[PDB]
Amino acid sequence: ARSEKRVPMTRLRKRVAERLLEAKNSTAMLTTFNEVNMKPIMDLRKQYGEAFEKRHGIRLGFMSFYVKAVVEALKRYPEVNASIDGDDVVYHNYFDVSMAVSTGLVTPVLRDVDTLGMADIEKKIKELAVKGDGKLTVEDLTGGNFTITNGGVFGSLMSTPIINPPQSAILGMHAIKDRPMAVNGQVEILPMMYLALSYDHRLIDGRESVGFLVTIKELLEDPTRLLLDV
Amino acid sequence: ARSEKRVPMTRLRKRVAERLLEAKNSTAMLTTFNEVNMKPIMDLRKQYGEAFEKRHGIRLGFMSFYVKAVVEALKRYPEVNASIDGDDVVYHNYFDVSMAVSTGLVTPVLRDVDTLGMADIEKKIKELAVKGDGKLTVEDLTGGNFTITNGGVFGSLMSTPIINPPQSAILGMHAIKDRPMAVNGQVEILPMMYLALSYDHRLIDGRESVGFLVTIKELLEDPTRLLLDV
Amino acid sequence: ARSEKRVPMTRLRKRVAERLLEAKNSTAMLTTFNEVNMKPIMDLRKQYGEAFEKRHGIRLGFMSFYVKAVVEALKRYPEVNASIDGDDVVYHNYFDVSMAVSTGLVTPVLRDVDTLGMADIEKKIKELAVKGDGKLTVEDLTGGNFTITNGGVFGSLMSTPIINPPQSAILGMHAIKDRPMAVNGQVEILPMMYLALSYDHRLIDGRESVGFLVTIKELLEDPTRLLLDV
Amino acid sequence: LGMADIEKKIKELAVKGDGKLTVEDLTGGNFTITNGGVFGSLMSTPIINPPQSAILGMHAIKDRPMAVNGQVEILPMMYLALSYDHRLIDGRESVGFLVTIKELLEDPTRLLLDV
């Protein structure tokens, strides 16, 4: 009933807090943005949804497309898939991608997503999403070379994600909103989504950060490009 | 007439500078953005402007709407209305909102805005705006749980506000510009304004920061929601 | 063939890294954004391109327009053209503008651009761009009061540039994209580009940062304003 | 001088025309610009002011049909007369001198680009 209520910082919250503070003071974090047209993917889902479910027992969603795109990007830009280890740059020759799941929020790791099929990525993601029960073992919460954080779920237009050290970058998805867009001289309404790539400028430079995000944009706007490799 | 002019840093400027530098190194500041359609409010003002003035002797402006919206948001998200006191989280059971007034810029405090009527908020805001004469006593400049900073006045499209410790977040208004928008399958021009909520990620998390801003968006786009509480 | 590859941080990369990290911890960097309509300039270039080339032997591009606009802005806001020297504010009475050229990226300096003609600025910029051969002497890489960094070249929509100490601000250009825009009640497609001005809030305040960017916007949207001084 | 400045100085002299015009003001000058549109002057022949070599005469701005990219449109047109001492200034120059004026007046931006 008094004007101020002091509640002791729980050890967990206290640990997290220090982490976040050191995450921002240890790195030279910067953020680059871009936008993507979710029309193509949304159509793929409308056309092959049922088929995909019957044939794989798992629903086709956005995530597998994002993860597939991220891996191809990580493949073209190993710098973004590397970490800084004191006086070293540790290039990882594998592809583990951390994926934020609500619970606070937690970062379970999808391992070797470069070898997984979409149905598979769709299943694993569900596993972790489901384990968020509270049965998330730290053997699940460790590692990861890159992180993808969703936020559209809340109605997030655009924002600045915080890096997750020792990782070098983080990709933040946002809400898909209809937005007027110029398309071949004509203005048309498309389901647009902003992408935010925050990165450690100590390791990753402009050209790369930009190109990394463009690549994601390209492969998401026409998944077929994954196949042709253009 | 020489190539360089060295002017000694005035003690005031020097104090401020150190503050700003420690404000950014002490916290894990992040920024989340969104946009609002100022059409509704602008209409309320056109329709009831005169009436409001005659009946209250004060002009109806944007501020009272922003402050009312902020308080309701602060009410739904006490975390954003709390501070971090060393090893504590101090939840404030009252509603003081700092409001940046030009002069440098100064942060006078509106106290217990949760009990004020719009006419009242309109008057108090004027008082402080007027005292910016230079009769601003520190009994006015202290406290505040949250801060609202206007910048549209200069033509600011969008930007990143800096937190004002010990406060946990800050809401930055910007210029209202006509922008094509998709409205029920049709593109229409609306008076849009971007909102930037910068916050201390040590205390406030994504879900909250996002939801906090969405709520503001919702209540500003239809003030009636304040009444129905939806 | 192993999962991790450790490559020693080269001394150069190591020096840079420390710099970037201290650039972000020493200052209270903030970023303000805006957008510009590149239609006007693009037309000037289409109309007078040939003429300009024949008469000056150098092609007319965007850069000279940006630099001319920046100088006029720097002239109206000396604070942005000043540095912080320990306990001092060093106002520079000259106009050197650092310009990022790819090679990593390097910041050659254009000296006294306030006295240069567009043809001249076009030539000098080419010199440095060409010396990027790798014949860039540090007598070229030193100094600079402000920095302009291009990124549209990569497809950069919008981003946050990092300040280059001892400098106080940095202007980041981005990709020019057609975007629907409201123009006198009618929606029309214009070649729009976002501008990001990051600045040291220890020295430069909102009003100034905003106004500095608006001015750039104004002079770029109608170069004639440089002549009339309005 | 900046335009604002030229605008002020011109006013000074226009105002001193009080009758406080000192010959220290009335001497010199390399070229002369004479306005006449003020009276409704369509076009005319200005007289040179020796020792000067030429003189530019402005005239009334009148709407006149004009061909503009295959289409006839009404524009606020004004004739320019450049009278000059042919002993020193030749055709090519007199013509080019006037064209240049025409160009820079039709698009002031050209002053900036220098084209």
Side-chain angles (χ1 to χ4, degrees), chain A residues 1-4 6-9 14 16-17 20-45 47-53 55-78 80-86 88-102 104-123 125 127-132 134-138 140-206 209-230, chain B residues 1-4 6-9 14 16-17 20-45 47-53 55-78 80-86 88-102 104-123 125 127-132 134-138 140-206 209-230, chain C residues 1-4 6-9 14 16-17 20-45 47-53 55-78 80-86 88-102 104-123 125 127-132 134-138 140-206 209-230, chain D residues 1-8 10 12-17 19-23 25-91 94-115:
Chain A
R2 301 195 172 144
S3 43
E4 284 155 325
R6 270 202 164 61
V7 333
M9 195 113 84
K14 186 176 175 175
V16 177
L20 297 163
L21 183 50
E22 73 157 4
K24 219 181 177 305
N25 296 358
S26 168
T27 61
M29 189 173 99
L30 291 174
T31 309
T32 191
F33 308 102
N34 203 106
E35 67 203 333
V36 60
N37 169 16
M38 298 306 287
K39 181 53 154 45
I41 287 179
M42 282 166 47
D43 289 344
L44 275 178
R45 294 222 302 134
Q47 185 165 220
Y48 303 120
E50 287 202 343
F52 191 96
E53 188 168 23
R55 175 173 246 263
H56 305 283
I58 184 59
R59 200 184 187 239
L60 179 65
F62 289 92
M63 282 303 176
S64 65
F65 284 104
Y66 299 158
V67 172
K68 270 299 164 200
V70 168
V71 171
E72 191 63 28
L74 250 26
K75 283 189 174 189
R76 306 187 186 180
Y77 298 104
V80 179
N81 187 201
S83 315
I84 294 186
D85 188 85
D88 289 327
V89 183
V90 183
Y91 297 82
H92 308 90
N93 286 344
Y94 48 104
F95 301 95
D96 297 340
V97 173
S98 294
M99 224 198 68
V101 77
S102 36
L105 216 73
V106 260
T107 300
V109 187
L110 291 172
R111 302 186 197 285
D112 301 296
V113 290
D114 64 299
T115 64
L116 270 34
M118 291 192 195
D120 293 332
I121 298 184
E122 287 293 345
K123 300 199 185 81
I125 290 179
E127 271 181 37
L128 312 181
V130 120
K131 276 189 168 185
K135 305 162 49 47
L136 231 55
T137 68
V138 71
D140 306 325
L141 288 310
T142 54
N145 294 165
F146 181 88
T147 295
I148 301 177
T149 193
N150 201 312
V153 297
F154 313 125
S156 189
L157 184 72
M158 180 181 40
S159 56
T160 51
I162 194 169
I163 329 179
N164 187 173
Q167 305 186 27
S168 295
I170 182 173
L171 174 76
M173 319 285 85
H174 299 81
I176 300 187
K177 280 221 318 170
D178 285 8
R179 197 130 68 64
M181 299 253 62
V183 172
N184 288 340
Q186 297 269 291
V187 21
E188 76 173 89
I189 294 181
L190 291 165
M192 300 293 296
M193 158 166 75
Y194 283 120
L195 300 184
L197 175 67
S198 278
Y199 60 107
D200 187 19
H201 191 24
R202 283 158 58 232
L203 169 54
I204 304 161
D205 65 317
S209 53
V210 173
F212 181 83
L213 203 39
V214 166
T215 294
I216 298 191
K217 170 190 174 63
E218 303 182 324
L219 309 170
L220 287 173
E221 288 181 347
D222 182 356
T224 305
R225 277 162 153 281
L226 289 167
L227 179 63
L228 306 171
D229 193 286
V230 286
Chain B
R2 301 195 172 144
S3 43
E4 284 155 325
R6 270 202 164 61
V7 333
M9 195 113 84
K14 186 176 175 175
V16 177
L20 297 163
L21 183 50
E22 73 157 4
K24 219 181 177 305
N25 296 358
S26 168
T27 61
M29 189 173 99
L30 291 174
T31 309
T32 191
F33 308 102
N34 203 106
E35 67 203 333
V36 60
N37 169 16
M38 298 306 287
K39 181 53 154 45
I41 287 179
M42 282 166 47
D43 289 344
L44 275 178
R45 294 222 302 134
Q47 185 165 220
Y48 303 120
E50 287 202 343
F52 191 96
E53 188 168 23
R55 175 173 246 263
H56 305 283
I58 184 59
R59 200 184 187 239
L60 179 65
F62 289 92
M63 282 303 176
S64 65
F65 284 104
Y66 299 158
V67 172
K68 270 299 164 200
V70 168
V71 171
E72 191 63 28
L74 250 26
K75 283 189 174 189
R76 306 187 186 180
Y77 298 104
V80 179
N81 187 201
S83 315
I84 294 186
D85 188 85
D88 289 327
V89 183
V90 183
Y91 297 82
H92 308 90
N93 286 344
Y94 48 104
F95 301 95
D96 297 340
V97 173
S98 294
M99 224 198 68
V101 77
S102 36
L105 216 73
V106 260
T107 300
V109 187
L110 291 172
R111 302 186 197 285
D112 301 296
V113 290
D114 64 299
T115 64
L116 270 34
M118 291 192 195
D120 293 332
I121 298 184
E122 287 293 345
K123 300 199 185 81
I125 290 179
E127 271 181 37
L128 312 181
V130 120
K131 276 189 168 185
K135 305 162 49 47
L136 231 55
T137 68
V138 71
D140 306 325
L141 288 310
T142 54
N145 294 165
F146 181 88
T147 295
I148 301 177
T149 193
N150 201 312
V153 297
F154 313 125
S156 189
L157 184 72
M158 180 181 40
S159 56
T160 51
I162 194 169
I163 329 179
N164 187 173
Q167 305 186 27
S168 295
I170 182 173
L171 174 76
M173 319 285 85
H174 299 81
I176 300 187
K177 280 221 318 170
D178 285 8
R179 197 130 68 64
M181 299 253 62
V183 172
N184 288 340
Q186 297 269 291
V187 21
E188 76 173 89
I189 294 181
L190 291 165
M192 300 293 296
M193 158 166 75
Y194 283 120
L195 300 184
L197 175 67
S198 278
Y199 60 107
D200 187 19
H201 191 24
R202 283 158 58 232
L203 169 54
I204 304 161
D205 65 317
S209 53
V210 173
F212 181 83
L213 203 39
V214 166
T215 294
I216 298 191
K217 170 190 174 63
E218 303 182 324
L219 309 170
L220 287 173
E221 288 181 347
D222 182 356
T224 305
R225 277 162 153 281
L226 289 167
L227 179 63
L228 306 171
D229 193 286
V230 286
Chain C
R2 301 195 172 144
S3 43
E4 284 155 325
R6 270 202 164 61
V7 333
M9 195 113 84
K14 186 176 175 175
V16 177
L20 297 163
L21 183 50
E22 73 157 4
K24 219 181 177 305
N25 296 358
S26 168
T27 61
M29 189 173 99
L30 291 174
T31 309
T32 191
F33 308 102
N34 203 106
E35 67 203 333
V36 60
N37 169 16
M38 298 306 287
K39 181 53 154 45
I41 287 179
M42 282 166 47
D43 289 344
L44 275 178
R45 294 222 302 134
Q47 185 165 220
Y48 303 120
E50 287 202 343
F52 191 96
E53 188 168 23
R55 175 173 246 263
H56 305 283
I58 184 59
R59 200 184 187 239
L60 179 65
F62 289 92
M63 282 303 176
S64 65
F65 284 104
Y66 299 158
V67 172
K68 270 299 164 200
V70 168
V71 171
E72 191 63 28
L74 250 26
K75 283 189 174 189
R76 306 187 186 180
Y77 298 104
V80 179
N81 187 201
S83 315
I84 294 186
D85 188 85
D88 289 327
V89 183
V90 183
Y91 297 82
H92 308 90
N93 286 344
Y94 48 104
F95 301 95
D96 297 340
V97 173
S98 294
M99 224 198 68
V101 77
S102 36
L105 216 73
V106 260
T107 300
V109 187
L110 291 172
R111 302 186 197 285
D112 301 296
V113 290
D114 64 299
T115 64
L116 270 34
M118 291 192 195
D120 293 332
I121 298 184
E122 287 293 345
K123 300 199 185 81
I125 290 179
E127 271 181 37
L128 312 181
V130 120
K131 276 189 168 185
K135 305 162 49 47
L136 231 55
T137 68
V138 71
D140 306 325
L141 288 310
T142 54
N145 294 165
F146 181 88
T147 295
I148 301 177
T149 193
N150 201 312
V153 297
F154 313 125
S156 189
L157 184 72
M158 180 181 40
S159 56
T160 51
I162 194 169
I163 329 179
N164 187 173
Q167 305 186 27
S168 295
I170 182 173
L171 174 76
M173 319 285 85
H174 299 81
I176 300 187
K177 280 221 318 170
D178 285 8
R179 197 130 68 64
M181 299 253 62
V183 172
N184 288 340
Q186 297 269 291
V187 21
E188 76 173 89
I189 294 181
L190 291 165
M192 300 293 296
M193 158 166 75
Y194 283 120
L195 300 184
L197 175 67
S198 278
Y199 60 107
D200 187 19
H201 191 24
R202 283 158 58 232
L203 169 54
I204 304 161
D205 65 317
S209 53
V210 173
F212 181 83
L213 203 39
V214 166
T215 294
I216 298 191
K217 170 190 174 63
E218 303 182 324
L219 309 170
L220 287 173
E221 288 181 347
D222 182 356
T224 305
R225 277 162 153 281
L226 289 167
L227 179 63
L228 306 171
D229 193 286
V230 286
Chain D
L1 270 34
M3 291 192 195
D5 293 332
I6 298 184
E7 287 293 345
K8 300 199 185 81
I10 290 179
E12 271 181 37
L13 312 181
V15 120
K16 276 189 168 185
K20 305 162 49 47
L21 231 55
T22 68
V23 71
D25 306 325
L26 288 310
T27 54
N30 294 165
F31 181 88
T32 295
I33 301 177
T34 193
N35 201 312
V38 297
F39 313 125
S41 189
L42 184 72
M43 180 181 40
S44 56
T45 51
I47 194 169
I48 329 179
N49 187 173
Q52 305 186 27
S53 295
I55 182 173
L56 174 76
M58 319 285 85
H59 299 81
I61 300 187
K62 280 221 318 170
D63 285 8
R64 197 130 68 64
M66 299 253 62
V68 172
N69 288 340
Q71 297 269 291
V72 21
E73 76 173 89
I74 294 181
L75 291 165
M77 300 293 296
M78 158 166 75
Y79 283 120
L80 300 184
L82 175 67
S83 278
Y84 60 107
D85 187 19
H86 191 24
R87 283 158 58 232
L88 169 54
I89 304 161
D90 65 317
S94 53
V95 173
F97 181 83
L98 203 39
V99 166
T100 294
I101 298 191
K102 170 190 174 63
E103 303 182 324
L104 309 170
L105 287 173
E106 288 181 347
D107 182 356
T109 305
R110 277 162 153 281
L111 289 167
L112 179 63
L113 306 171
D114 193 286
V115 286

PDB file of all heavy atoms in Angstrom, chain B residues 9-18, unseen atoms left out:
ATOM      1  N   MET B   9      35.251  23.098 -21.349  1.00  0.00           N
ATOM      2  CA  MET B   9      33.991  22.448 -21.058  1.00  0.00           C
ATOM      3  C   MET B   9      33.430  23.032 -19.760  1.00  0.00           C
ATOM      4  O   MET B   9      34.069  22.969 -18.703  1.00  0.00           O
ATOM      5  CB  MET B   9      34.219  20.940 -20.893  1.00  0.00           C
ATOM      6  CG  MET B   9      32.968  20.088 -20.942  1.00  0.00           C
ATOM      7  SD  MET B   9      32.953  19.040 -22.391  1.00  0.00           S
ATOM      8  CE  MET B   9      33.924  17.648 -21.822  1.00  0.00           C
ATOM      9  N   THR B  10      32.258  23.644 -19.851  1.00  0.00           N
ATOM     10  CA  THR B  10      31.614  24.202 -18.672  1.00  0.00           C
ATOM     11  C   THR B  10      31.244  23.040 -17.749  1.00  0.00           C
ATOM     12  O   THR B  10      30.800  21.982 -18.217  1.00  0.00           O
ATOM     13  CB  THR B  10      30.359  24.973 -19.066  1.00  0.00           C
ATOM     14  N   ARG B  11      31.407  23.248 -16.445  1.00  0.00           N
ATOM     15  CA  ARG B  11      31.092  22.239 -15.432  1.00  0.00           C
ATOM     16  C   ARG B  11      29.741  21.544 -15.636  1.00  0.00           C
ATOM     17  O   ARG B  11      29.632  20.327 -15.480  1.00  0.00           O
ATOM     18  CB  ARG B  11      31.170  22.868 -14.034  1.00  0.00           C
ATOM     19  CG  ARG B  11      32.501  22.621 -13.311  1.00  0.00           C
ATOM     20  N   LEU B  12      28.725  22.311 -16.012  1.00  0.00           N
ATOM     21  CA  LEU B  12      27.400  21.753 -16.240  1.00  0.00           C
ATOM     22  C   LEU B  12      27.451  20.757 -17.391  1.00  0.00           C
ATOM     23  O   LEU B  12      27.054  19.601 -17.239  1.00  0.00           O
ATOM     24  N   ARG B  13      27.993  21.198 -18.522  1.00  0.00           N
ATOM     25  CA  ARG B  13      28.100  20.357 -19.707  1.00  0.00           C
ATOM     26  C   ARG B  13      28.926  19.124 -19.384  1.00  0.00           C
ATOM     27  O   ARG B  13      28.590  18.009 -19.800  1.00  0.00           O
ATOM     28  CB  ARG B  13      28.742  21.128 -20.870  1.00  0.00           C
ATOM     29  N   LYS B  14      29.974  19.325 -18.589  1.00  0.00           N
ATOM     30  CA  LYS B  14      30.873  18.250 -18.190  1.00  0.00           C
ATOM     31  C   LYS B  14      30.141  17.217 -17.334  1.00  0.00           C
ATOM     32  O   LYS B  14      30.347  16.014 -17.498  1.00  0.00           O
ATOM     33  CB  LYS B  14      32.069  18.823 -17.438  1.00  0.00           C
ATOM     34  CG  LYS B  14      33.137  17.814 -17.107  1.00  0.00           C
ATOM     35  CD  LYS B  14      34.311  18.506 -16.446  1.00  0.00           C
ATOM     36  CE  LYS B  14      35.373  17.514 -15.976  1.00  0.00           C
ATOM     37  NZ  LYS B  14      36.577  18.226 -15.438  1.00  0.00           N
ATOM     38  N   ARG B  15      29.282  17.688 -16.431  1.00  0.00           N
ATOM     39  CA  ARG B  15      28.528  16.783 -15.564  1.00  0.00           C
ATOM     40  C   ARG B  15      27.572  15.972 -16.425  1.00  0.00           C
ATOM     41  O   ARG B  15      27.544  14.738 -16.354  1.00  0.00           O
ATOM     42  CB  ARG B  15      27.751  17.571 -14.507  1.00  0.00           C
ATOM     43  N   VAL B  16      26.818  16.668 -17.268  1.00  0.00           N
ATOM     44  CA  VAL B  16      25.862  16.019 -18.157  1.00  0.00           C
ATOM     45  C   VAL B  16      26.553  14.910 -18.953  1.00  0.00           C
ATOM     46  O   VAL B  16      26.146  13.746 -18.909  1.00  0.00           O
ATOM     47  CB  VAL B  16      25.245  17.041 -19.145  1.00  0.00           C
ATOM     48  CG1 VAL B  16      24.299  16.350 -20.124  1.00  0.00           C
ATOM     49  CG2 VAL B  16      24.506  18.126 -18.379  1.00  0.00           C
ATOM     50  N   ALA B  17      27.627  15.284 -19.643  1.00  0.00           N
ATOM     51  CA  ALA B  17      28.392  14.360 -20.463  1.00  0.00           C
ATOM     52  C   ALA B  17      28.724  13.057 -19.734  1.00  0.00           C
ATOM     53  O   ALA B  17      28.434  11.972 -20.232  1.00  0.00           O
ATOM     54  CB  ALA B  17      29.651  15.042 -20.949  1.00  0.00           C
ATOM     55  N   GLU B  18      29.303  13.165 -18.544  1.00  0.00           N
ATOM     56  CA  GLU B  18      29.653  11.985 -17.760  1.00  0.00           C
ATOM     57  C   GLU B  18      28.398  11.145 -17.507  1.00  0.00           C
ATOM     58  O   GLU B  18      28.421   9.919 -17.648  1.00  0.00           O
ATOM     59  CB  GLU B  18      30.302  12.397 -16.437  1.00  0.00           C
TER      60      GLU B  18
END
